[PDB]
C-alpha cells in the first residue's frame, strides 16, 4: 500500500480509515492519568484485512474488545519520538468498505507528551489543578491509540468524568453534563464533533472554568480571574467571524468558543475546532491584539477544513491561514494595513533564514520529515514564505479579489479532505487554466523546494512602514544634542502596530546609548504601554541598552506570564546583562514553581541552574 505519512506508524489511510471515535474517559488529577475506552469505528479500504496498526506513545493498554471478545494485540519496538505501533489481530477478515468497532481500554502516562497537567500554583486561582492537551503535531497517540496522521479525518463523541468542582471542554460542541452515576464526587461532561477532523485537533481542557456569552455562537471561557477582561477584549469575535465567512466561505463548525488559558501557558494560540485556545498575553486592555485571533479563526477554513495530508505539507495550512488572516485585517483596517503586515512578515522571514541559515532544510516550504520530529518541524518559514508565495501569486494573477476567488474555490474543493502541495498546485493550474502561461513563469523549484529567501520579493505598499523607518533612523542616527527635537508629536498618526514596528526596527539596531533610551522614555512614555508585544520589545531594547530601571520591569514581565516568546528572550537578556544576572537568578528560583514546567526547565537550561 502507498505509505502516505512517514511520521505515523499506523496502517495508512490507503489500507483502513477511522471514521468515528467514541471516547469515554476519566480524568484523575492525583495520578495525572486519563483512563477509559476509545471505541474506533474503522473502515477497511482493502479486501482480506485481518490486522491493523495504530499509533501509541506511552500508553498502558488493558484490553482490546471487538464484538465483545478480547482480541490479541502487540506493541512493537518504540521508534523514538514516533512511539510504538500497536498491531491488533482482527477476529474477522475485513473486505473493502467493511466496518468494525474496536474498543481499546487504555490509560495515559503521567509523562504523556500531549497532556499538560498544572499544579494549583501554576493556575490563576491557586486552588484547583488544571489540564490541557496539545496534540499538534503527533501527540494524540500519547492520549489514545489512533491513526495519528492528518491524512485520516474522523468525527467524535466523548464522555468525560471529572471531579465535580471542575469543568471539561473539548474541540467539539458541548452536549450536557450530569452527575457521574458511578461516583457522586464527579460529573460527566459530554461532547459531539459532527465535522470530520484530523486527530491532532482533538483537544481537552479540565479546570475551574467560567464562561461569558459574547456572541450568538461564542462563549469565552477562562478561570474566574480572567474571564471578565477576556469577554471585553474579544467582544468583536463575531464580527471577525462574519468577515472570515465573507472571505473564505461559510463557517461549518457550529460554535466558535474561546478559551483563555492560564498565565503560565507558554505558547501562542491553537485553532482547536469549536474552541480556540488563546494566550492571556493578548489581554492588552484596548483590544490592540484582539485581531491576533484572526489567525485561529482563519484555520477554521485553511487547516481544519482543508488539511495538510502529512507534516511535510504543513505550509499549506499555515501559509493559506496567514493569507486569509491578513485579508481579515485588511477588511478591518484597510489594504495599506494588509501591506504593512505583509511587509513585516517579509522581515520575519529574512530573520529566520538568517537564524536557521539560507541552507537549512527548515527554510524550505516543502520539507522531508522522514527522519525529523514533526513536533519540532512544524515550528518555524511555513508561515511567511508560504504567505509570500500566495501574495506573489496574487499579484501575478490579477490581484486580491481574483485570488480570493481561488481561495474560496480551493476551500470548497477540498473541504473535509487532506491534501498535498501537488494537489494544491494542480488545483491552482486548473482554476487559472486561463493564465497558465503566467503560472509557468513561476520558479516553483525555488519557491517550494529550495532553502533560503524566495527568488522574487512581492511588491509592498510602503505607506505605514515609512513613518516607522523615518522615526527609527532619526533616533538611530541622533546625537545627544539632537535629543531635544524628539517629542510626543512624533507618534501622532502611529497605530499601536506602528509603535511596535518602530520598536522592532530600533531593537534591530540595539543598543542605543543610555541617554537616548532615557529620552525615548521621557517623550514617548513606553513604560506606560500594556500591549505585551510593545512592552516586550521596549524592555528588550532597555536591557540591551543597559538601562538600570528596566531590570525590575523585565523580570516582572518575564514571570507574570509564561509565553515562551517573551519569557525566554527576557530571561536571556537579563542574564546577558551582567548587572541583572544575579537578580535574574534569584527571581527564577523564587518563581519557577508558578511557571509552566517546560518554561522553568528551558529557562533553567538558559540560566544554567
Ligand atoms: Zn497557525
Could you say which DSSP state residue 473 is in? H
Last residue of a domain, one of 207, 232, 262: 207
How far away, in angstroms, is 532 Cα from ligand 1 center? 20
Q: Same domain for 446 and 331?
A: yes
Q: Please check whether residue 1 lies inside any domain of the structure.
A: no
- Residue 269 sits at the vertex; the CA angle it makes with 265 and 273, to the nearest 5 degrees, is 120
Which helix (H) or strand (E) covers residue 19, if one does?
strand 16-28
Alpha helices in 80-147 (DSSP H): none
**For residue 137, is the peptide bond before it cis, meaning its omega torsion is within 30 degrees of 0?**
yes
Q: Same domain for 591 and 468?
A: yes
**For residue 511, is the peptide bond before it cis, meaning its omega torsion is within 30 degrees of 0?**
yes
Sheet holding 186-198, edge to edge: 69-70, 59-66, 99-108, 33-44, 16-28, 153-163, 186-198, 173-179
User: 327-357 burial, b if ≥16 CB within 10 A, otherwise e?
Assistant: bbbbbbbeeebbbbbbbbbbeebeebbeebe
**Residue 126, number of CB atoms within 10 A of its CB:** 12
Check if 416 is active-site.
no
How far away, in angstroms, is 497 Cα from ligand 1 center? 20
3-state helix, strand, coil in the chain (%, to 5): 45, 25, 35
How far away, in angstroms, is 402 Cα from ligand 1 center? 24
Phi and psi, residue 263, nearest 5°: -55, -30
Q: Which domain holds residue 276?
A: 208-304
User: 57-68 burial, b if ≥16 CB within 10 A, otherwise e?
Assistant: bbbebeebbbee
Check if 383 is active-site.
yes
Could you say which DSSP state residue 94 is in? E
Number of folded domains in the chain? 4
Query: Which is the catalytic residue, given 200, 256, 378, 383?
Result: 383
Q: Do 279 and 564 touch, CB atoms closer than 8 A?
A: no
Dist. CA 201–CA 212, nearest whole Å: 24
Phi and psi, residue 161, nearest 5°: -90, 125
- Residue 348 sits at the vertex; the CA angle it makes with 342 and 353, to the nearest 5 degrees, is 130
Phi and psi, residue 54, nearest 5°: -120, 155
Q: Taking Cα atoms as reference points, which of 345, 304, 350, 305 lies closest to residue 323?
A: 345
Q: Same domain for 126 and 273?
A: no
Dist. CA 163–CA 167, nearest whole Å: 8
Dist. CA 556–CA 400, nearest whole Å: 43
Q: Please check whether residue 182 lies inside any domain of the structure.
A: yes
Q: What is the resolution of this structure in A?
A: 1.8
Q: From the centroid of its chain, how far is CA 272?
A: 9
Q: Is 295 annotated as a binding residue?
A: yes
Dist. CA 275–CA 221, nearest whole Å: 9
- Mention every residue, 6+ apart, whose C-beta is less than 8 A from residue 539: 550, 553, 554, 557, 570
Q: Please check whether residue 385 lies inside any domain of the structure.
A: yes
Q: Taking Cα atoms as reference points, which of 216, 278, 276, 211 lies closest to residue 242?
A: 216
Which helix (H) or strand (E) covers residue 99, if one does?
strand 99-108
Dist. CA 398–CA 79, nearest whole Å: 48
**Technique used to solve these coordinates:** X-ray
Q: Cell numbers of 158, please?
A: 466523548
Residue with cell 497537567: 117
Dist. CA 490–CA 468, nearest whole Å: 10
Beta strands per DSSP E along 369-498 = 417-419
Q: Taking Cα atoms as reference points, which of 206, 185, 95, 65 lies closest to residue 143?
A: 206
Q: Same domain for 500 and 537?
A: yes
- Mention every residue, 6+ apart, whose C-beta is less than 8 A from residue 107: 33, 34, 35, 59, 60, 62
Residue with cell 548587572: 579
* Residue 603: CATH number of its domain: 1.25.40.320
* Strands 69-70 vs 16-28: parallel, antiparallel or unpaired: unpaired
Q: Same domain for 277 and 328?
A: no
How far away, in angstroms, is 318 Cα from ligand 1 center? 5
How far away, in angstroms, is 305 Cα from ligand 1 center? 13
User: 573-584 burial, b if ≥16 CB within 10 A, otherwise e?
Assistant: bbbebeebeeeb
- Mention every residue, 6+ apart, whose C-beta is less than 8 A from residue 601: none
CA of 115: how far to CAs of 140, 172, 204, 232, 609, in Å? 9, 18, 9, 29, 26
How far away, in angstroms, is 299 Cα from ligand 1 center? 7
Q: Do 385 and 365 touch, CB atoms closer than 8 A?
A: yes
Q: Same domain for 165 and 41?
A: yes
Residue with cell 488559558: 261
Q: Cell numbers of 550, please?
A: 528596566
Q: Is 99 annotated as a binding residue?
A: no
Dist. CA 548–CA 457, nearest whole Å: 41
Dist. CA 63–CA 37, nearest whole Å: 10
Q: Taking Cα atoms as reference points, which of 344, 345, 336, 282 lies closest to residue 318?
A: 345
Q: Do 95 and 173 touch, CB atoms closer than 8 A?
A: no
Dist. CA 188–CA 580, nearest whole Å: 49
Q: Is 564 annotated as a binding residue?
A: yes
Query: Which is the catalytic residue, given 223, 233, 296, 533?
Result: 296
Q: Same domain for 299 and 318?
A: no
Q: Same domain for 201 and 213?
A: no
Q: Is 270 annotated as a binding residue?
A: yes
Q: Cell numbers of 112, please?
A: 504523556
CA of 334: how far to CAs of 28, 331, 389, in Å? 49, 6, 21
Q: Cell numbers of 116, please?
A: 499538560
How far away, in angstroms, is 379 Cα from ligand 1 center? 10
How far away, in angstroms, is 276 Cα from ligand 1 center? 11
Q: Taking Cα atoms as reference points, which of 383, 252, 268 lies closest to residue 320?
A: 383
* Residue 152: CATH number of its domain: 2.60.40.1730
How far away, in angstroms, is 583 Cα from ligand 1 center? 36
* Strands 204-207 vs 167-170: parallel, antiparallel or unpaired: antiparallel
How far away, in angstroms, is 173 Cα from ligand 1 center? 21
How far away, in angstroms, is 135 Cα from ligand 1 center? 14
Q: Please check whether residue 7 lies inside any domain of the structure.
A: no
* Residue 568 DSSP SS3: helix
How far away, in angstroms, is 271 Cα from ligand 1 center? 7
Phi and psi, residue 194, nearest 5°: -90, -15
* Strands 218-222 vs 257-260: parallel, antiparallel or unpaired: parallel
Q: Cell numbers of 431, please?
A: 482554476
Instruction: Show the 3-state SS of 289-324.
Output: CHHHHHHHHHHCCECCCEEECCHHHHHHHHHHHHHH
Phi and psi, residue 503, nearest 5°: -65, -40
Q: Same domain for 47 and 155?
A: yes
Dist. CA 265–CA 273, nearest whole Å: 19
- Mention every residue, 6+ apart, whose C-beta is less than 8 A from residue 111: 58
Q: Same domain for 224 and 300?
A: yes
Dist. CA 6–CA 371, nearest whole Å: 8
How far away, in angstroms, is 535 Cα from ligand 1 center? 23
How far away, in angstroms, is 536 Cα from ligand 1 center? 21
How far away, in angstroms, is 597 Cα from ligand 1 center? 24
Q: Please check whether residue 99 lies inside any domain of the structure.
A: yes
Could you say which DSSP state residue 150 is in? T
Q: Is 266 annotated as a binding residue?
A: yes
* Residue 247: CATH number of its domain: 3.30.2010.30
* Residue 488 DSSP SS3: helix
How far away, in angstroms, is 382 Cα from ligand 1 center? 10
Q: Please check whether residue 343 lies inside any domain of the structure.
A: yes
Residue with cell 518554561: 599
Beta strands per DSSP E along 126-274 = 130-133, 153-163, 167-170, 173-179, 186-198, 204-207, 210-215, 218-222, 257-260
Q: Please check whether residue 75 lies inside any domain of the structure.
A: yes
Identify the burial level of 597 via C-beta atoms within 10 angstroms of its C-beta, where 0-12 means exposed, 13-18 middle and 19 or more buried.
middle
Q: Is 135 annotated as a binding residue?
A: yes
Q: Do 25 and 202 touch, CB atoms closer than 8 A?
A: no
Q: Cell numbers of 142, please?
A: 500519547
Phi and psi, residue 524, nearest 5°: -105, -10
Q: Taking Cα atoms as reference points, which of 158, 253, 248 lies closest to residue 196?
A: 253
Instruction: Show the 3-state SS of 48-82.
Output: CEEEEEEEECCEEEEEEEECCEECCEEECCCCHHH
Dist. CA 104–CA 114, nearest whole Å: 18
How far away, in angstroms, is 320 Cα from ligand 1 center? 10
Contacts of 600-607 with CB under 8 Å at 24 or more apart are: 602/564, 602/568, 603/567, 603/568, 603/571, 606/568, 606/571, 606/572, 606/575, 607/571, 607/575
Last residue of a domain, one of 207, 230, 249: 207
- The DSSP-derived string for 436-470 is HHHHTTS-HHHHHH--SS-SSPPP---HHHHHHHH
Dist. CA 339–CA 216, nearest whole Å: 32
How far away, in angstroms, is 300 Cα from ligand 1 center? 10
Q: Cell numbers of 326, please?
A: 491578513
User: 378-413 burial, b if ≥16 CB within 10 A, otherwise e?
Assistant: bebbbbbbbbbbbbbbbebbeebeebbebbeebbee
Dist. CA 459–CA 104, nearest whole Å: 55
Q: Taking Cα atoms as reference points, which of 358, 360, 345, 356 lies closest to residue 392?
A: 345
Q: Please check whether residue 8 lies inside any domain of the structure.
A: no
Q: Same domain for 444 and 490?
A: no
Q: What is the biggest distance separating any 2 CA atoms in the chain, rounded to whole angstroms?
A: 87
In terms of residues, how long is the chain? 609
- Helices (H) and strands (E) counted in the chain, each on its own, are 19, 21
Q: Do 287 and 158 touch, CB atoms closer than 8 A?
A: no
Residue with cell 534591530: 508
Q: Same domain for 86 and 194?
A: yes
Q: Taking Cα atoms as reference points, which of 163, 164, 34, 169 lies closest to residue 105?
A: 34
Q: Taking Cα atoms as reference points, which of 150, 108, 153 lies closest to residue 131?
A: 108
Last residue of a domain, one of 262, 287, 304: 304
Phi and psi, residue 258, nearest 5°: -120, 140
Dist. CA 154–CA 145, nearest whole Å: 14
Amino acid at each position: 500500500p502507498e505509505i502516505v505519512d512517514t511520521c505515523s506508524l499506523a496502517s495508512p489511510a490507503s489500507v483502513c480509515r477511522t471514521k468515528h471515535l467514541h471516547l469515554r474517559c476519566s480524568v484523575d488529577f492525583t495520578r495525572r492519568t486519563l483512563t477509559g475506552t476509545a471505541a474506533l469505528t474503522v473502515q477497511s479500504q482493502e479486501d482480506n484485512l485481518r490486522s491493523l496498526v495504530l499509533d501509541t506513545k506511552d500508553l498502558t493498554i488493558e484490553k482490546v474488545v471487538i464484538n465483545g471478545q478480547e482480541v490479541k494485540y502487540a506493541l512493537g519496538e518504540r521508534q523514538s519520538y514516533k512511539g510504538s505501533p500497536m498491531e491488533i489481530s482482527l477476529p474477522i477478515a475485513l473486505s473493502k468498505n467493511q466496518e468494525i468497532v474496536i474498543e481499546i481500554s487504555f490509560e495515559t502516562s503521567p509523562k504523556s507528551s500531549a497532556l499538560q497537567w498544572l499544579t494549583p500554583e501554576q493556575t490563576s486561582g491557586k486552588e484547583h489543578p488544571y489540564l490541557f492537551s496539545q496534540c499538534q503535531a503527533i501527540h494524540c497517540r500519547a492520549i489514545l491509540p489512533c491513526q495519528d496522521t492528518p491524512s485520516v479525518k474522523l468525527t467524535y463523541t466523548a464522555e468525560v468524568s471529572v471531579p465535580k468542582e471542575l469543568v471539561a471542554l473539548m474541540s467539539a460542541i458541548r452536549d450536557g453534563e450530569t452527575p457521574d452515576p458511578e461516583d457522586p464526587s464527579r460529573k460527566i461532561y459530554k461532547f459531539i464533533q459532527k465535522v470530520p477532523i484530523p486527530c491532532y485537533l482533538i483537544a481537552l481542557v479540565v479546570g475551574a472554568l467560567e464562561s461569558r456569552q459574547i456572541g450568538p455562537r461564542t462563549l469565552v471561557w477562562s478561570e474566574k480571574e480572567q474571564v471578565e477582561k477576556s469577554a471585553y477584549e474579544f467582544s468583536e469575535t463575531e464580527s471577525m467571524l462574519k468577515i472570515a465567512e465573507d472571505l473564505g466561505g461559510p463557517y461549518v463548525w457550529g460554535q466558535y468558543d474561546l478559551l483563555v488559558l492560564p498565565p503560565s501557558f507558554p505558547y501562542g494560540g491553537m485553532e482547536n475546532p469549536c474552541l480556540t485556545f488563546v494566550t492571556p498575553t493578548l489581554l492588552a486592555g484596548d483590544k490592540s491584539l484582539s485581531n491576533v485571533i484572526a489567525h485561529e479563526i482563519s484555520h477554521s477554513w485553511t487547516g481544519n477544513l482543508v488539511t495538510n495530508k502529512t507534516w511535510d505539507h504543513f505550509w499549506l495550512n499555515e501559509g493559506h491561514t496567514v493569507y486569509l488572516e491578513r485579508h481579515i485585517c485588511g477588511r478591518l483596517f484597510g489594504e495599506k494595513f494588509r501591506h504593512f503586515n505583509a511587509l513585516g512578515g517579509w522581515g520575519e522571514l529574512q530573520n529566520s533564514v538568517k537564524t536557521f541559515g539560507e541552507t537549512h532544510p527548515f527554510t524550505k516550504l516543502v520539507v522531508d520529515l522522514t527522519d525529523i520530529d514533526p513536533n519540532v518541524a512544524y515550528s518555524s518559514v511555513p508561515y511567511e514564505k508560504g504567505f509570500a508565495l500566495l501574495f506573489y501569486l496574487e499579484q501575478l494573477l490579477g490581484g486580491p479579489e481574483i485570488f480570493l476567488g481561488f481561495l474560496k474555490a480551493y476551500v470548497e474543493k477540498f473541504s473535509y479532505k487532506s491534501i498535498t502541495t501537488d494537489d494544491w498546485k494542480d488545483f491552482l493550474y486548473s482554476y487559472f487554466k486561463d493564465k497558465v502561461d503566467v503560472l509557468n513563469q513561476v520558479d516553483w523549484n525555488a519557491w517550494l523546494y529550495s532553502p533560503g529567501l524566495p527568488p522574487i520579493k512581492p511588491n509592498y505598499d510602503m505607506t505605514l512602514t515609512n513613518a516607522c523607518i523615518a522615526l527609527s533612523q532619526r533616533w538611530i542616527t541622533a546625537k545627544e544634542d539632537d535629543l531635544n527635537s524628539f517629542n510626543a508629536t512624533d507618534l501622532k498618526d502611529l497605530s499601536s502596530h506602528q509603535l511596535n514596528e518602530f520598536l522592532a526596527q530600533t531593537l534591530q539596531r540595539a543598543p542605543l546609548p543610555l541617554g537616548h533610551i532615557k529620552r525615548m522614555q521621557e517623550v514617548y512614555n513606553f513604560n506606560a504601554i500594556n500591549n505585551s508585544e510593545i512592552r516586550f520589545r521596549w524592555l528588550r531594547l532597555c536591557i540591551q541598552s543597559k538601562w538600570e530601571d528596566a531590570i525590575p520591569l523585565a523580570l516582572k514581565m518575564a514571570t507574570e506570564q509564561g509565553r515562551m516568546k517573551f519569557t525566554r528572550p527576557l530571561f536571556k537578556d537579563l542574564a546577558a546583562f551582567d548587572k541583572s544576572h544575579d537578580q535574574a537568578v534569584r527571581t527564577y528560583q523564587e518563581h519557577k514553581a508558578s511557571m509552566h514546567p517546560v518554561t522553568a526547565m528551558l529557562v533553567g537550561k538558559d540560566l544554567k541552574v
